[PDB]
């Protein structure tokens, strides 16, 4: 797995709160980042996961964590989806579009015969290092409060080396 | 260009008049086909081109010409666009999703740095041979009327190998 | 397709108005150019196509557009055809000879089994970027006025960056 | 990631509640399995993670789920650890030894600079398909409850496909 | 040089006596053939050469020698040359078009930087073997009677094998 | 064989009489060293070989000879073994751990199908040159006396070259 | 063909007028040169060809044309041919030996399965450019006066650049 | 090391008790073999080692063990040496000559920049498997009674699998 | 050297006693053969060498030995040389022409920079095995009687397997 | 053959008049050299050839010709052979050992399936150029007299480039 490796450079368009923006790896430097992958806009499993993250987003921002959802759809499609799902509408973090699949392949997370990203979540520290990975099949929902726990634990070990907190 | 070459095998999902289906090269055998590529759903020039084609779709079906629009969006996104745009809503032909890019790359039509198809139109005879190609830049829309002219010309030269259609068709 | 790519350097002899000239990519720089490819001189379809472009050539010149007709024949042949056909006789743009096929292959437009160019038209902006392509089968003629309409649209978006043009 | 791929053939020795058994992929056929990797026995860290799974093992078995812990240590070391740690002692699932690192590389889970497996958990269905993956850095703990929840979700969609 | 080698197969359109025909290697089998390459239709130097040859053509034919002129122009252009030039119009043999340059390259006779053939003449016995070659520069012209002497000579040695003729 | 070649750079953790130390090739410079490989800690075989060397360790040190035992186990496992086996407990030389197998492959001594080191002993002189090699199959025992004799012979020809 | 290309450097021993000399590309610079290849010394067909040429040699020289005959025999053998054959003995120009076959291969003129040159003649202007080529089979012989006409022609076009001569 | 690998085919001339003979791997099948390498005939370290083995040879033969000394000298040189050293004279086992170095390289035991074999001893069981290896520098003498011990131990484990005898 | 290797197949024209013949490896089979290589006909050293062999040729024939002289010259040249030189005139063995250099290169005896053979003699037994080689520098002549002595020795060891022949 | 080529660098040990020495290509520079290869010490044809050379060795030294015999045996074996054979005992020139084969392979003279040199003799001029080569089969001994003849011929053509030595030398 990619655990404990440094993330790779990327440049992508995103939709974020009514605005189109660009995102590169430089935007993640010095920050905690969550890269939240999912297969496709306008499907019926992803949104509750995405919505669950949206619910915890104010908390993540207070922890200094940025969230980037990623799929191989375009940022245009993201804006449309955001306009038409009540669940997606409550997303205020960056929805990155990855139509070239470069970001997705950076994380070794492409279904090559589908052109869609696997349902994988990556936690990345200020120095670019991946510290937690979660990948599930469709229907095995990713729980955002567990994600929150892992990040507080990651942040804690970063602040107290030599000491660690297990299960 | 790919003029006068046979199209490659493919297999993609599509949205068509309210349902999801598979389209392959076998579905085009013995038929006239139009592969109408565009960059992305929910953008700006595309709807006018696609709707203009839709307007001529009933006419085209009588020429036994099928239409397949293609972008690298999924068929799920096509369905949504069709349910939110009044223009897209009048499309009765198949909207193919090419998220892998394979269909687009078959027609050598990918902007590789963008992951989107160029605005290319390919006319394909019942034997699979590309008979007309049109490609425009991002801000240049295509005229569905001239498209029909080119299809009628093609079926003519097919119907009468002994002759020709010079500039500007008129039946 | 070659859409949105820059044209390759070339160097060719051409017949233009009673005289023989040289053409290179440097003549096309800072100009709008049409490269009008056709199969062979002294054949049965091309006269009308070339003749139509000629009918529009005055307006084309007014819009700063240069026209180059290309076949794999020589400029000697073009000169002869100009004399024999009253249609070809009205051409006042450059008729390029491409007997090495180099210029034709630059545009990837060779019928390798026949050594003749396919029926392709190429619109090239002042930066050498290809902005429109039309290619038809051997029995299908091209409409010069549809071409002109494309050029005007291309010139428009060049002149108004934020905007676009459908039909 | 290895999500949705089929596990590879393996053959390893293991310690399981008082004896040495061999474990192959054939043992996992028809069952739910958890492959739980960790870097090393006998460390200075309290092995709360293995014991945590041990605590939930009675349920796991009641769900038809088998558990295999895996490190690049030998099964000899596992027998030793099991006899000296009160926490490890309460493990009744099989502790696999992987000194060739083959089982670990099958799951693409080797820290190459260290010769130890990363903290990775793989949930494998009865057809041998990986349905869930979890990997964490040293110092971030895996929660056996969150694993139990995922397993039951994996079993539910197995039994009721396309139910949203 | 290609001297004493077999010719390679080919398939070309050609203008000859008003109508268009096809020429392949199968047409030269069992016959004497002259392949007469030149650079380009509608130029200055080539016509006298072809006309000189054409002058000797009816003689050649009674010797059982077919003539095939070749340039990289189309057979279409050849027909147009035939109607505009008093010289060329007196050609009764086949004017082969070689726009793909295949036939020309078969004889290793293509100026690759020009897409034109060099001024080369090949004499080919009925077995398909090249028995005489003449190549000159864009300035010098080929004398047809000299070709006729080289052909008769090539024929003697074949009909009288085991002898030689300077 | 590796006879008469120079040992390669290494860096390993080790257990040595109550503590964890790091050992590199720089520690062997200027000294006589014995690298004593074995396949695994905590086995069902009585480790007579390591103890046998332990018995002769006081002399070895008196000859300026250092001893390093090496297995593909971790130094954690070594600390464990040392605290549970009466025989191992009497070892006072460094027990190196080699879980990457790098040290072992340096001496070309890995059983690849097993991920364990073969029963090999290497005697290395102060310039880092291998002067004697011994390798035996499982079940054939190494004799610490025969090792002592070879070391003293290696030291003698070192001091009196070409004396026959 | 090699028509209109530059000749490649070479260094060969040669027999000429009783004494042995060396010939390199440096000797042809600034001059008209005829390279006259033949298969083998002491055979039947070659001598009349060389003798025919030799007949025209003093004429050639006043045109500033050097002649170099070439076969894959040694210059030693050339000298012996010169003493045994009445025909050959009247050769006043250079008989180059090419036993390594380098010079012959330079002109792409080696029958590789024989180690002999083909009957090829090359005309080379002072800039080292081949302006005329004639190759015939082991039966046909080359007419020297015809070579002389092809040379004078090649000279006119160079002295009157921008004109042509059939 | 070559421990526990199968020996490779070889064909070599040897001197053995006044007689020249051939030896191949087939001669070792079903037998215990010692391959005793040394650098060169007519030197002053090898013979006592070789002589020590000669002393124990009757014992080795009673154990069913064959002995092959090997060096890159020829079998002719062996016969000469045997005639002129009293120590070598008491050798009654096969002295293999390996002037091509093939046998020596089979055991990965060549000093390539010397063309001489290293001082290595290999113990090989009836099935071709190497069970003990000893390699020393010059002057660190190989002791034949230790060799004897190792062979009795090897033979013992072969006869009693599951049981083993350590140090 | 090529000593003790088998000769390669060849096919060459040769002058032998007023007539032109073909020689191949099949003519040498079941025979003893001398291949006498020399640089060039009509040069200044070879006459004596060839002449000497000729002096011994009668005895050579009596011993079942065939002689082939080889140079890169043609058989036409050999025929001419046979007429002009009273020395060469006394040769009654085959004078092979090797203008392709194929036969010369078979014996690895080409002066690549000169296209002439080196001065090498080769003795080939009835099985095609090369049993003796002599090669000298350009100014050094070969002794035909030393050659004859070699052939007799070679024929002897062929006839008496267990035995050998010094000087 | 290697005729008219320069010998390659080498470095070997040798036995020579009771002592062990190194020989390299540098030792041959400016000297006439004979490299006299034979298959193996303690065999049967070799001693006669080597002793025959020894008989001519004093003469050869006056021609400024050095001799190096070579086999793939060690120099230790040469010393022994020299101390046990009356024939070998009279050798005063250097007996080179080529156990690695490198010297032998320099002269392309190895029987690779045997690890022994063939019976080859190479004459080498002071500039390193091979001027005469003789190779015989296993049972054919070489004549040291004819060897001298060839060396005298070689020094002659060296001393007088303007001339030649035809068949059978006679000073
Ligand atoms: Cl991963
Ligand atoms: Cl295309
Ligand atoms: Cl294109
Ligand atoms: Cl994974
Ligand atoms: Cl040619
Ligand atoms: Cl080793
Ligand atoms: Cl040529
Ligand atoms: Cl080994
Ligand atoms: Cl040889
Ligand atoms: Cl040689
Ligand atoms: K997409
Ligand atoms: K053309
Ligand atoms: K291990
Ligand atoms: K390990
Ligand atoms: K020759
Ligand atoms: K040896």
UniProtKB/Swiss-Prot annotation, chains B, J:
EC code(s) of this entry: 1.11.1.26
EC top class named in words: oxidoreductase
Cellular-component GO terms for this entry: cytosol
Subcellular location: Cytoplasm
Enzyme active site: 46
Domain Thioredoxin: 1-156
InterPro entries tied to this protein: AhpC, AhpC/TSA, Peroxiredoxin, Peroxiredoxin_AhpC-typ, Peroxiredoxin_C, Thioredoxin-like_sf, Thioredoxin_domain
Family the entry assigns: Belongs to the peroxiredoxin family. AhpC/Prx1 subfamily.
GO biological process: cell redox homeostasis; hydrogen peroxide catabolic process; response to oxidative stress
GO MF annotation list: NADH-dependent peroxiredoxin activity; thioredoxin peroxidase activity
Catalytic activity: a hydroperoxide + NADH + H(+) = an alcohol + NAD(+) + H2O
Subunit structure: Homodimer; disulfide-linked, upon oxidation. 5 homodimers assemble to form a ring-like decamer.
Pfam families for the chain: 1-cysPrx_C, AhpC-TSA
Keywords: Antioxidant, Cytoplasm, Disulfide bond, Oxidoreductase, Peroxidase, Redox-active center
Miscellaneous remark of the record: The active site is a conserved redox-active cysteine residue, the peroxidatic cysteine (C(P)), which makes the nucleophilic attack on the peroxide substrate. The peroxide oxidizes the C(P)-SH to cysteine sulfenic acid (C(P)-SOH), which then reacts with another cysteine residue, the resolving cysteine (C(R)), to form a disulfide bridge. The disulfide is subsequently reduced by an appropriate electron donor to complete the catalytic cycle. In this typical 2-Cys peroxiredoxin, C(R) is provided by the other dimeric subunit to form an intersubunit disulfide.
Protein name: Alkyl hydroperoxide reductase C
Function: Thiol-specific peroxidase that catalyzes the reduction of hydrogen peroxide and organic hydroperoxides to water and alcohols, respectively. Plays a role in cell protection against oxidative stress by detoxifying peroxides.
Keyword Transmembrane helix: no
Transmembrane segments: none
The species this protein was found in: Salmonella typhimurium (strain LT2 / SGSC1412 / ATCC 700720)
Main location: cytoplasm
Signal peptide as annotated in the record: none
Swiss-Prot record, chains E, G:
Keywords per UniProt: Antioxidant, Cytoplasm, Disulfide bond, Oxidoreductase, Peroxidase, Redox-active center
Signal sequence, start to end: none
E.C. number: 1.11.1.26
Record's subcellular location: Cytoplasm
Record protein name field: Alkyl hydroperoxide reductase C
Matching Pfam families: 1-cysPrx_C, AhpC-TSA
InterPro entries attached to this UniProt entry: AhpC, AhpC/TSA, Peroxiredoxin, Peroxiredoxin_AhpC-typ, Peroxiredoxin_C, Thioredoxin-like_sf, Thioredoxin_domain
Residues annotated as catalytic: 46
Taxonomic superkingdom: Bacteria
A single cellular component GO annotation: cytosol
Subunit comment: Homodimer; disulfide-linked, upon oxidation. 5 homodimers assemble to form a ring-like decamer.
Uppermost EC category: oxidoreductase
UniProt record, GO biological process: cell redox homeostasis; hydrogen peroxide catabolic process; response to oxidative stress
Known function: Thiol-specific peroxidase that catalyzes the reduction of hydrogen peroxide and organic hydroperoxides to water and alcohols, respectively. Plays a role in cell protection against oxidative stress by detoxifying peroxides.
